[PDB]
Enzyme design. Structure first.
Site, mmCIF file in Angstrom:
data_model
loop_
_atom_site.group_PDB
_atom_site.id
_atom_site.type_symbol
_atom_site.label_atom_id
_atom_site.label_comp_id
_atom_site.label_asym_id
_atom_site.label_seq_id
_atom_site.Cartn_x
_atom_site.Cartn_y
_atom_site.Cartn_z
ATOM 1 N N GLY B 93 0.800 -0.925 0.222
ATOM 2 C CA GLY B 93 0.299 0.068 0.237
ATOM 3 C C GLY B 93 0.922 1.159 0.264
ATOM 4 N N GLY B 94 0.820 1.977 1.003
ATOM 5 C CA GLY B 94 1.605 3.279 0.575
ATOM 6 C C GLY B 94 0.768 4.610 0.428
ATOM 7 N N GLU B 142 -4.692 3.476 2.696
ATOM 8 C CA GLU B 142 -4.891 4.847 3.371
ATOM 9 C C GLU B 142 -6.363 5.420 2.403
ATOM 10 O OE1 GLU B 142 -1.584 6.479 3.992
ATOM 11 O OE2 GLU B 142 -0.247 5.627 4.093
ATOM 12 N N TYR B 143 -7.286 5.032 2.617
ATOM 13 C CA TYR B 143 -7.967 3.895 4.145
ATOM 14 C C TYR B 143 -9.003 3.243 3.396
ATOM 15 C CZ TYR B 143 -4.753 7.061 6.618
ATOM 16 O OH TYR B 143 -4.034 7.726 7.408
ATOM 17 N N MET B 210 -0.172 5.775 12.277
ATOM 18 C CA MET B 210 0.290 7.211 11.706
ATOM 19 C C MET B 210 0.764 8.842 12.237
ATOM 20 S SD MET B 210 -0.287 5.598 7.665
ATOM 21 C CE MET B 210 -2.183 5.763 8.035
ATOM 22 N N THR B 211 0.775 8.489 13.645
ATOM 23 C CA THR B 211 0.973 9.946 14.536
ATOM 24 C C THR B 211 1.767 10.663 13.774
ATOM 25 O OG1 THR B 211 2.341 8.250 16.411
ATOM 26 C CG2 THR B 211 -0.647 8.946 16.553
ATOM 27 N N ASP B 213 2.120 14.102 10.484
ATOM 28 C CA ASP B 213 1.726 14.124 9.411
ATOM 29 C C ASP B 213 0.418 15.028 9.868
ATOM 30 O OD1 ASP B 213 3.116 13.494 7.192
ATOM 31 O OD2 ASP B 213 1.983 11.957 6.585
HETATM 32 C C1 LIG Z 1 7.571 12.682 3.183
HETATM 33 C C2 LIG Z 1 7.538 11.120 2.247
HETATM 34 O O1 LIG Z 1 8.435 10.596 2.911
HETATM 35 N N1 LIG Z 1 6.429 10.763 2.112
HETATM 36 C C3 LIG Z 1 5.916 9.481 1.304
HETATM 37 C C4 LIG Z 1 5.019 9.275 1.451
HETATM 38 O O2 LIG Z 1 5.132 8.919 2.450
HETATM 39 C C5 LIG Z 1 3.816 8.485 3.327
HETATM 40 C C6 LIG Z 1 3.644 6.910 4.076
HETATM 41 O O3 LIG Z 1 3.062 6.521 2.491
HETATM 42 C C7 LIG Z 1 2.186 6.778 4.087
HETATM 43 N N2 LIG Z 1 2.783 4.642 4.767
HETATM 44 C C8 LIG Z 1 3.333 5.474 6.008
HETATM 45 C C9 LIG Z 1 3.538 3.478 6.886
HETATM 46 O O4 LIG Z 1 4.087 6.148 6.729
HETATM 47 C C10 LIG Z 1 2.393 8.175 5.296
HETATM 48 O O5 LIG Z 1 1.434 7.320 6.581
HETATM 49 O O6 LIG Z 1 2.489 8.742 5.731
HETATM 50 C C11 LIG Z 1 3.433 8.872 5.101
HETATM 51 C C12 LIG Z 1 4.692 9.929 4.983
HETATM 52 O O7 LIG Z 1 3.657 11.540 4.230
HETATM 53 O O8 LIG Z 1 5.200 7.925 0.689
HETATM 54 C C13 LIG Z 1 4.440 7.637 -0.771
HETATM 55 C C14 LIG Z 1 4.227 6.761 -1.331
HETATM 56 O O9 LIG Z 1 3.296 6.069 -0.873
HETATM 57 C C15 LIG Z 1 5.962 9.022 -0.939
HETATM 58 O O10 LIG Z 1 5.612 9.276 -2.611
HETATM 59 C C16 LIG Z 1 6.005 10.006 -0.637
HETATM 60 O O11 LIG Z 1 7.459 10.494 -0.874
#
Ligand SMILES: CC(=O)N[C@H]1[C@H](O[C@H]2[C@H](O)[C@@H](NC(C)=O)C(=O)O[C@@H]2CO)O[C@H](CO)[C@@H](O)[C@@H]1O
Ligand SMILES: CC(=O)N[C@H]1[C@H](O[C@H]2[C@H](O)[C@@H](NC(C)=O)C(=O)O[C@@H]2CO)O[C@H](CO)[C@@H](O)[C@@H]1O
Lengths: 496, 497
Positions: B93-94, B142-143, B210-211, B213
């Site tokens: 995911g992500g 998400e989500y 994810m505490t 952002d």
């Molecule tokens: C700031 C950063 O590194 N952004 C990348 C982003 O990070 C996301 C994660 O995808 C997401 N999951 C987890 C486990 O943290 C999240 O909750 O926040 C982080 C930070 O914002 O990921 C994407 C790919 O999905 C990258 O392209 C971003 O650069």
């Protein structure tokens, strides 16, 4: 279509057993007081009260002289010769028999418990109806608690089924048998079944709101018992409906149930209209033909909104009959209540009462400066505003408690009939005033609105409006990426 | 029990296909940066990210060179020789792949729809796990929205059954395959599935919150993105949880979800603890290894809680790389985010940033008085409070996004391991401050209360307290003649011992 004018008519068992039409000392208001002219002013007379016995069936109070009773009922049905639209209904319940702590409460709870009890009860309702010559069934249970609701509903549905079959069987298409209930007119008791209002109302011709007793000695502050609209200077109350098992969101509950709020007749009506499936045509506004009196009130506002020293328990916990000029209070041993007939007689005598008027609540009240008394009641004037409200809100009609409390001339009943039907009465210029209006919004009274159709794939900011599935929605916060109904960030705010 | 230390490790497809450990301009943070000492500091590494394809199966992004992918994963699993407790998990995911408008969102939604789709998807997760040599599966969707939650739960339960069977089959009882998910750390997204949190967490070893952002340029007021506790001077928000399909009354929602509230790490942790059936031991607090920058900020309060002029959209819309000293920003073309590694170098390059500290939120921030810049981030000092909070609240541990953003020495990972395991680190006297604590009370975390039993046939005055059927109840208005539990007149306020 003609507005319903439903007069509950209460004759205590002692009066049935000693019925006489020539001694107001024994029967203060006998059927003979209902002349042909008055019969024409009513659309329904709800004879009160029958009860539910331990055999769990509808039945007259055990102490009743069945022959005198059948005779009293016959005099009522004889009135139908003068009004072909008139129905003599009988009402089961009332505060005395059916309240939580009342003499027959258990019987109501158990009568609706099972398909079998419900069937046996429903059938006794129709049998009693046909046996005594009544034209319909009114249920006045105050009030089924939340757990007893589904059973109460099933019972009304079964009665409806049986009455419809009976109407066909008796060729009564012209004047079908009817089923109504007397419903709460205040949020506290309404909260008990509010969530299921649509189901409760579906089998009924009307739901008669007890939009009275909204103030009384059991309350700390004197107030109007049937204010049409709110007075910012009066007491406000906790909005019990926000606690109903509605399954709505905080946002939905808050906009439908402002709290605190003014306990008024308009509040109760609006509260019913907010629910989906509760047609305005089935709502009937109740009005009181009696006043409630308080003693030991202070001055400065004509007795309104004052602390007092009036006992609130039933029966009246004393022998002190302090309502100056109320001989009826002496006869009935309670100075906290008086019929409009008596109130008028008190005003006509010199007992020191000043009749005042509140232009916000649109209701009269009496103030006795000397002894510190306050009486809240209704009259032909307050009925002008309520009648206009009923027309504006497209309600089914008016109901009142109770006929036997009107004056000998039948002025309160006449006023009601006049406001709805007299060719020479014109309330087009009647000003409804600036009293507080209940402003809650719910599924049943959403405003007609227009907005662009929701577009899948679109991201909406906070406050955006879209139309979807025939409703208009607004986002509660920003960056909304899901559709209305599937994303709780959307609030239904309009319709069409 | 040892606290988990879970580091997501993000390596983009392009870096995998051009993988090298001798060219920082191509692969900024290679696996070679993780020495045996560093490997011992982790309990889990979550390789990020795999995806769900149109066949509704777990898979690498199609553009991935498979040989190169196995090589990067082998470098990670080789770290296990230096730590018998270490697990190299893979995360599906992500944000990029799974957000509502993401490129593969429909695949997540469709994969969890039926018993058949769930079985097929779950079997593919185990297949990928064994094929590449991973030790567990982490789902980072998400989500899921309300309607998709039941499918999501069933899919997790299905993966759990398959992983347990695999553990037995492989004789892996000493280091059982695991299942985790990354979950929202803020009320707005959390409201989507909050009502069913207990069912979602049941099949999991951990839920990684994810505490972070919690603030960003997409917000009109500058703020700390991961404040531990609230600052009354900072912005507050509507508590979206009040809109979750919980079936609670207005009083229960109001008491459980104070609003407006401070969006903090403590608020997310407490919101999860509030729900019945969510064990603190499964909650893993996330911390960021990057900061977020704002421009056009005003002075007076170090740039905190000020209006700004930062583009909030993605991708960054211009070429104005205004974060002074951030060359990483120029390369990645976004001045709104910088790795801790880069932020440390900006501070070192004497570019005019002042490192400030908020003793309410217990977090650092950069303020550039000259150019009007504000940067919210975390460091080894803010981690001291977060680690003590994790110990205090009895949480399962810490998680972080993401390993490749630590400095070359690995100071942020080392700090976390230190706070949980170093014999010579003692935080018994560390002062947690007077910042705002989240204290909602929900029918899921009622206090033990004591009151006379309910007496049928009694009429209760407003505010009366009675015990009845395992709970203590309070009347919300007067002349109550009904029993507690059923009707709306009674509010559940406590539990009977
Ligand atoms: C700031 C950063 O590194 N952004 C990348 C982003 O990070 C996301 C994660 O995808 C997401 N999951 C987890 C486990 O943290 C999240 O909750 O926040 C982080 C930070 O914002 O990921 C994407 C790919 O999905 C990258 O392209 C971003 O650069
Ligand atoms: C003031 C009065 O007449 N009180 C009598 C009381 O009237 C109740 C009704 O029972 C109840 N039902 C309806 C349809 O009105 C109600 O809502 O309010 C009126 C007025 O309070 O009824 C009891 C018997 O039940 C009488 O003994 C009271 O005198």
């Amino acid at each position: 279509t003609r507005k319903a004018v439903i007069g509950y008519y209460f004759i205590p068992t002692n009066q049935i057993n000693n019925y006489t039409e020539t001694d107001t000392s024994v029967v203060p208001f006998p059927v003979s007081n209902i002349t042909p002219a008055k019969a024409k002013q009513l659309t329904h007379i709800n004879f009160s009260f029958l009860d539910i016995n331990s055999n769990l069936e509808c039945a007259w109070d055990p102490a009743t002289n069945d022959a005198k009773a059948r005779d009293v009922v016959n005099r009522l049905t004889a009135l139908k010769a003068h009004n072909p639209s008139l129905r003599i209904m009988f009402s089961i319940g009332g505060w005395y028999y059916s309240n939580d702590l009342g003499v027959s409460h258990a019987n109501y709870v158990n009568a609706v418990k099972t398909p079998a009890s419900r069937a046996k009860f429903a059938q006794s309702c129709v049998r009693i109806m046909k046996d005594y010559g009544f034209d319909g069934v009114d249920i006045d249970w105050e009030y089924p608690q939340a757990a007893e609701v589904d059973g109460f509903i099933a019972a009304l549905q079964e009665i409806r089924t049986l009455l419809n079959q009976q109407t066909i069987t008796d060729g009564r298409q012209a004047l079908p048998y009817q089923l109504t209930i007397a419903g709460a007119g205040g949020a506290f008791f309404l909260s008990r079944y509010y969530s299921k209002l649509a189901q409760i109302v579906a089998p009924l011709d009307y739901i008669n709101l007890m939009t009275y007793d909204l103030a009384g000695p059991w309350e700390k502050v004197t107030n109007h018992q049937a204010a049409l609209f709110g007075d910012a200077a009066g007491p406000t109350f906790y909005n019990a409906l926000r606690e109903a098992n509605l399954g709505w969101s905080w946002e939905e509950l808050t906009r439908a149930f402002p709290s605190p709020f003014s306990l008024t007749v308009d509040a109760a009506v609006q509260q019913h209209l907010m629910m989906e499936g509760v047609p305005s045509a089935k709502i009937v506004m109740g009005v009181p033909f009696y006043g409630r009196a308080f003693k030991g009130v202070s001055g400065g506002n004509g007795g309104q909104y004052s602390s007092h020293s009036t006992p609130g328990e039933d029966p009246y916990p004393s022998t002190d009959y302090w309502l100056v000029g109320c001989e009826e209070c002496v006869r009935d041993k309670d100075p906290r209540i008086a019929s409009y007939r008596q109130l008028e007689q008190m005003l006509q005598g010199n007992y020191g009462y000043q009749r005042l008027w509140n232009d916000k609540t649109k209701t009269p009240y009496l103030y006795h400066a000397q002894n510190g008394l306050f009486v809240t009641y209704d009259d032909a004037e307050s009925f002008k505003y309520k009648a206009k409200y009923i027309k504006q809100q497209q309600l089914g009609g008016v109901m009142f408690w109770h006929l036997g409390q009107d004056n000998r001339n039948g002025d309160l009943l006449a006023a009601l009939d006049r406001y709805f039907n007299a060719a020479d009465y014109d309330d087009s210029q009647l000003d409804m005033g600036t009293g507080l209006r209940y402003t809650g919004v719910g599924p049943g009274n959403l405003p007609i609105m227009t907005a662009p159709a929701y577009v899948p794939g679109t991201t909406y900011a906070q406050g955006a409006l879209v139309s979807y599935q025939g409703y208009v929605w607004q986002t509660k916060w920003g960056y909304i990426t899901s559709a209305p109904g599937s994303d709780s960030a959307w609030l239904k705010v309009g319709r069409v």
